[PDB]
């Protein structure tokens, strides 16, 4: 029952963010939540192109790197490329058919677009530092470690999309499909979305920031500085992305947008907590993989794991979850130099 | 069976454009068809923001317009806003889940994004020339004439999306749903896509260019020049969009990409012809609506209808269809001044 132009003249100011009447007219003179209009504006203002940045010198640095330092950098690079390959397409595929307010619809499309730019920046870096890019891109699919992360992260999207399809096609209720029972529940679907949004928040607010640390650690050694220049632009975008999901999540659980979602958010509050913890642990285990053959100046498994806990605590409080780790100070204050923007707090 | 990250290490160079394995890694070092990489590049290079353009003087001109000339301009404006409200979301929703090569996936996302910019430019114009924008935006949904166009155009998208959902959920074959027979056919789905792409080609290559003429006709009278400045930027993008669908359509019917699609394209060649003709006639009837209360200097129902036939012939030959109208010269050569770009033939 999805329509690319719903025929009812509805008041878009009184629609919920999700699961309401599909947006008909795209208008930007008014908003229910002006945060998404501001995010669109900021992201438009940030528009950049990867090939602005000269990454030539990074080839020399990379070749000069010890084998284990190559492993650190290229594993990091591949993980990012995996993540925003997913972030490139998934906000559009998973969220668009469910959005019911214009400013949120356009934010998601703008969001996903900015991710394709990130992916294009990744190709730019890879082409310049390795001799055979195909080897790198192929390993992204077949790497045992990377693959485990891709499966879990994509599943939150995939389950939302499939349940969405059933909901559009079948509507709410209990159904018969080829002799099997299919029960469609809006409440369940709302839960799938909330959990997915929680996962994506973790993806962009925690997982990527763990990766930023790895990149900026090289730049602290005055190595791979072209890459770092790009990561700075990427991080500035990422601060907007996570801000977006933070507002979606908080507006959903407050019950201001949809009173049913307030109850659903409480029901699965433990699940969201467990989700965020599992992600933190997975990034801790990733640190293990990165530094399995040795570490580098200013960054090792212990320091990175400290940062995981430090950033995880912050992000989880932002979305109303209990803190899973001891209250700690910033283990790598040098990262703040790189994570700065005059137009947004990165 | 849609996955946001398919787990198989496939050779993306040997995948079809559509219905192949969902794209896993987004890479831009290689293409099967470099046309889509070039389109991405060009569209990125064209990136503009609506509020650059000063449309202040357009308020004065608009208020000074005779009532029937207001009707002409605002009906035109509303039609465009309808069209790119649909074009804003639909390429993403309808095409993304079906794409199987990275460069096409990113082009579609870039395409749809550029449409949101067009929609934002429409809001910009409307806010500045009318006192109550809500009246304008509401009429887009309830206008009898506009509504007829929205229904037909959206249906091509909607039918593709729904059949897509069935295909992902059920796979090919004959199925039982709540005691009804549901037959899923890839061949049928491929046809739904082809027809949809034909429709979208007509939308952007014909329908919008009919509208460009109306806008530039005002500018020829040195009226509504802020609007025209924006339409010039929009037209430059639109030339890329229609180029995109022209290549998709021609690559599909050639059988180079997918031999099955060559046969399917021939089978429904009449249907595509009838589709394009029906669209041309609908724009002719739209000209009737625009000029029902009188015309203006340099543009009336007769002249615009001539342009419809002139542009329709050109577009249809580009996609391998028979010409539906007499071979004619350009009835409004003055439009070429406005439809020019040094980076692309508009």
Output the DSSP codes for B218-282. Answer: HHHTT-SHHHHHHHHHHHHHHHHHHHHHHHHHHHHHHSSS-HHHHHHHHHTHHHHHHHHHHHHHH
- Quote the CA–CA distance of A101 and A97 in Å, as a whole number: 11
Within 10 angstroms of residue A133's Cβ, the number of other Cβ atoms is 18
Burial A110-123 (b: 16+ CB within 10 A, else e): bbbbbbbbbbbbbb
Give the nearest partner residue to B141 out of A24, A133, A165, using CB atoms. Answer: A24
Question: Residue B182 belongs to what H/E stretch?
Answer: strand B180-184
Q: For A156-180, b where at least 16 C-beta lie within 10 A, e where not — what string?
A: bbbebbbbbbbbbbbeeeebebeee
Which 3 state secondary structure label does DSSP give A182? strand
Q: What is the dihedral of CA A326, A330, A331, A337, to 10 degrees?
A: 160
Q: Does A48 touch chain B (CB under 8 A)?
A: no
Contact yes or no for B23 and A142 at CB 8 A: no
Contacts of A48 in chain B (CB under 8 A): none
Instruction: Provide, as residue numbers in chain B, all residues whose Cβ is less than 8 Å from the Cβ of A96.
Output: 89, 92-93
Q: Using CB atoms, pick whichever of A8, A120, A169 lies closest to residue B28.
A: A120
Q: What 8-state DSSP symbol labels residue A175? A: E
B99 forms beta bridges with B18
- Quick check: B283 and B208 in contact, CB under 8 A? no
> What is the three-class DSSP state of A120?
helix
DSSP per residue over B125-162, as a string?
HHHHH-S-HHHHHHHHHH-HHHHHHHHHHHHHHHHHHH
B106/A120 Cβ within 8 A: yes
Task: State both tokens at B86.
Answer: 């649909």
Q: Measured between CB atoms, which of B97, B150, B161 is closest to A5?
A: B150
| Closest to B157 (Cα-Cα) out of A84, A22, A268, A88 | A22
Q: What is the CATH number of the domain that holds B346?
A: 1.10.620.20
| Residues B17 and B261 sit within 8 Å (Cβ to Cβ) | no
Q: Is A44 on the interface with B (CB under 8 A)?
A: yes
- Phi–psi pair at A171, nearest 5 degrees: 70, 180
Count, residues in chain B? 346
Chain A partners of B169 at a C-beta cutoff of 8 Å? 162, 165-166, 169
Is the distance from CB of A82 to CB of A152 less than 8 angstroms? no
Query: Does residue A109 contact residue B113 with C-beta atoms inside 8 Å?
Result: yes
Instruction: Give ∠ CA B207-B213-B219 in degrees, rounded to 5.
Output: 145
Contacts of A30 in chain B (CB under 8 A): 134
Count of CB atoms situated within 10 Å of the CB of B135:
11
How far is it, in rounded angstroms, from Cα A31 to Cα A28? 7
Contact B96 A97 (CB under 8 A): no
Strand partners, B175: B182
- Could you give the CA distance from residue A141 to residue A136 in angstroms, rounded to a whole number? 9
If we measure between CA atoms, which residue out of A104, A98, A105, A94 comes closest to residue A21? A98
Contacts of residue B147 in chain A, CB cutoff 8 Å?
7
Q: Confirm if B85 and B149 have CB atoms less than 8 A apart.
A: no
Residue among B9, B134, B137 minimizing CB distance to A141: B9
Cβ neighbours, 10 Å, residue A264: 23
Q: For residues A210 and A324, what is the distance between their CA atoms, to the nearest angstrom?
A: 17
Given a contact cutoff of 8 angstroms between Cβ atoms, the answer to whether A62 and A53 are in contact is: no
Q: Which two tokens stand for residue B215?
A: 């806008």
Q: Structure tokens of A254?
A: 């407050």
Contact indicator for B55, B125 with CB cutoff of 8 Å: yes
Q: Is the CB of B325 inside 8 Å of chain A's CB atoms? A: no
For chain B, state the CA radius of gyration: 21
Domain count of the fold of chain B: 1
Best residue in B2, B9, B28, B179 for a mutation probing chain A (most A CBs within 10 Å):
B28
Distance CA B116, CA B215 (A): 20
Sheet holding B173-177, edge to edge: A180-184, A173-177, B173-177, B180-184
Distance CA B260, CA B187 (A): 8
Burial of B27-52, coded b for 16+ CB within 10 Å and e otherwise, reads bbebbbbebbbebbbbbbebeeebee
Query: Please, are residues B182 and B176 in contact by the beta-carbon 8 Å criterion?
Result: yes
Give the side-chain half-sphere CA count within 13 A for A45: 13
Closest-CA residue to B18 (of B191, B263, B173, B155): B191
Q: Please indicate if any CB of chain B lies within 8 Å of the CB of A135.
A: no
Distance between CA atoms of A17 and A197, rounded to whole angstroms? 13
Whole-angstrom distance, CA of residue A22 vs CA of residue A5: 7
User: CB-based contacts of A253: which residues, under 8 Å, 6+ apart?
Assistant: A194, A261, A262, A265, A266, A320
User: To probe the interface with A, which of B42, B84, B89, B93 has the most A CB atoms within 10 Å?
Assistant: B89
d(CA B96, CA B85): 18
Residues 6+ apart with CB under 8 A from B85: A5, A23, A24, A25, A26, B119, B140
CB B249 within 8 A of CB B194: yes
Token match 């870096």: residue?
A: A125
Q: From CA B33, how far away is CA B16, in angstroms rounded?
A: 10
Distance CA B16, CA B14 (A): 7
CB-CB under 8 Å, B157 with A84: no
Distance CA B114, CA A64 (A): 42
Half-sphere exposure of B278 (CA within 13 A, CB side): 12
Closest approach of A116 to chain B, Cα-based (Å): 7
How far apart are alpha carbons B294 and B280 in whole angstroms?
22
Report how far apart, in Å, the C-alpha atoms of A26 and of each of A48, B48, B115, B210 are.
25, 18, 10, 21
Please give the helix or strand (H or E) that residue A299 lies within, else none. Answer: none
Closest CA to B75 of B186, B183, B218: B218
Report the alpha-carbon distance of residue A340 to residue A30 in Å, rounded: 31
Angle at B55 between CA B288 and CA B146, to 5 degrees: 30
Sign, Cα dihedral of A124, A96, B113, B248: positive
Catalytic residue among A33, A62, A79, A122: A122
Is A233 at the interface with chain B, CB within 8 A?
A: no
Cβ distance of B9 and A138 shorter than 8 Å: yes
Closest of B258, B281, B253, B257 to residue B269, by C-alpha: B253
CA distance B221 to B211: 16
Active site residue A122: yes
**Residue B116: which H helix or E strand, with range?**
helix B102-129
Name the 3-class secondary structure at A180: strand
Contacts of B336-345 with C-beta under 8 Å, sequence gap 24+, read B338/B212, B338/B216, B338/B219, B338/B228, B338/B231, B338/B232, B338/B235, B339/B212, B339/B216, B339/B232, B339/B235, B341/B236, B341/B239, B343/B42, B343/B45, B343/B46, B343/B236, B344/B42, B344/B236, B344/B239, B344/B240, B344/B243, B345/B239
Cα four-point dihedral sign B103, B106, B108, B110? negative
Method in brief: X-ray
A125 contacts chain B (CB < 8 A): no
Kind plus residue range of the DSSP H or E element containing B181 = strand B180-184
Confirm if A23 and A12 have CB atoms less than 8 A apart: yes
* Distance between CA atoms of residues B203 and A220, nearest Å: 52
Chain B contact set for A173 (CB, 8 A): none
Q: Pairing between strand B180-184 and A180-184?
A: unpaired
> What's chain A's Rg over C-alpha atoms?
21
- A 10 A CB-CB count for A254 gives 14
Return the closest-CA partner of residue B283 out of B311, B317, B316: B311
Q: 10 Å Cβ neighbour count for A270?
A: 11
| Out of A4, A8, A178, closest to residue B93 by CB | A4
3-state SS assignment for residue A115 = helix
CB atoms within 10 A of CB A263: 13
> In sequence order, which residues have a C-beta less than 8 Å from that of residue B126 and are 6 or more positions away?
A29, B77, B81, B133, B136, B137
Distances (CA, A) of A287 to A211, A279, A303: 10, 12, 9
Beta-carbon count within 10 A of A48 CB: 15
A332 vs chain B: nearest CA distance in angstroms? 31
Task: Give chain A positions within 8 Å (CB) of B113.
Answer: 109-110, 112-113
- Domain of A169 in residue numbering reads as 1-346
Cβ–Cβ contacts within 10 Å for residue A17, how many? Answer: 24
Q: Nearest CB to A97: which of B29, B93, B166?
A: B93
Q: At what angle do helices B269-290 and B259-267 cross, to 10 degrees?
A: 60
Taking CB atoms within 8 Å and a gap of at least 24, the contacts of B325-330 are B325/B280
B281: which 2 tokens?
């006639």
- Cα of B141 vs its chain's centroid, Å: 19
Q: Does B169 touch chain A (CB under 8 A)?
A: yes
Alpha-carbon distance of A227 to A259, in angstroms, equals 45
SS3 of residue B296 by DSSP? strand
Hunting for tokens 């069976």 — which residue is that? B1
Alpha-carbon distance A87 to A84, whole Å?
A: 4
Residue A23 contacts B where some CB pair is shorter than 8 Å: yes
Q: Any alpha helices (H) in A255-296, and if so which ranges?
A: 259-267, 269-290
Give yes or no for a contact between B50 and B120, defined as CB atoms under 8 angstroms apart.
Answer: yes
Beta strand segments in chain A, E: 173-177, 180-184
Q: Return the H-helix or E-strand segment holding B328.
A: none
Enter the tokens of residue A305. 């794991």
B222 C-beta neighbours (distance < 10 Å), count: 9
Q: Is the dihedral of CA A60, A66, A67, A73 positive or negative?
A: negative
Q: CA B17 to CA B24: how far, in whole Å?
A: 14
């Amino acid at each position: 029952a999805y329509t690319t132009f719903s025929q009812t003249k509805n008041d878009q100011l009184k629609e919920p963010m999700f699961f309401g009447q599909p947006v008909n007219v795209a208008r930007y003179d008014q908003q229910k939540y002006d945060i998404f209009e501001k995010l669109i504006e900021k992201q438009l203002s940030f528009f950049w192109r990867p090939e602005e940045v000269d990454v030539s010198r990074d080839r020399i640095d990379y070749q000069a790197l010890p084998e284990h330092e190559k492993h650190i950098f290229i594993s990091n690079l591949k993980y990012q490329t995996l993540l925003d390959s997913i972030q490139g397409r998934s906000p559009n595929v998973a969220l668009l058919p469910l959005i019911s307010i214009p400013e949120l619809e356009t934010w998601v499309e703008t969001w996903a677009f900015s991710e394709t730019i990130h992916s294009r920046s990744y190709t730019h870096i890879i082409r310049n530092i390795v001799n055979d890019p195909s080897v790198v891109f192929d390993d992204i699919v077949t790497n045992e470690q990377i693959q485990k992360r891709a499966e879990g992260i994509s599943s939150y999207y995939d389950e939302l999309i499939e349940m969405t399809s059933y909901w559009h096609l079948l509507g709410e209720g209990t159904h018969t499909v080829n002799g099997k029972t299919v029960t469609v529940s809006l409440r369940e679907l709302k839960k799938k979305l909330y959990l997915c949004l929680m996962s994506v928040n973790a993806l962009e607010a925690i997982r990527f920031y763990v990766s930023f640390a790895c990149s900026f650690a090289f730049a602290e050694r005055e190595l791979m500085e072209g890459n770092a220049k790009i990561i700075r632009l990427i991080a500035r975008d990422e601060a907007l992305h996570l801000t977006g999901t933070q507002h979606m999540l908080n507006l959903l659980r407050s019950g201001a947008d949809d009173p049913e979602m307030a109850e659903i958010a409480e029901e699965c509050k433990q699940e969201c907590y467990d989700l965020f913890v599992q992600a933190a642990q997975q990034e801790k285990d990733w640190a293990d993989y990165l530094f399995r053959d040795g570490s580098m100046i200013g960054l090792n498994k212990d320091i990175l794991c400290q940062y995981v806990e430090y950033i995880t605590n912050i992000r989880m409080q932002a979305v109303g979850l209990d803190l899973p780790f001891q209250t700690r100070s910033n283990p790598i204050p040098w990262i703040n130099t790189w994570l700065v923007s005059d137009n947004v707090q990165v």
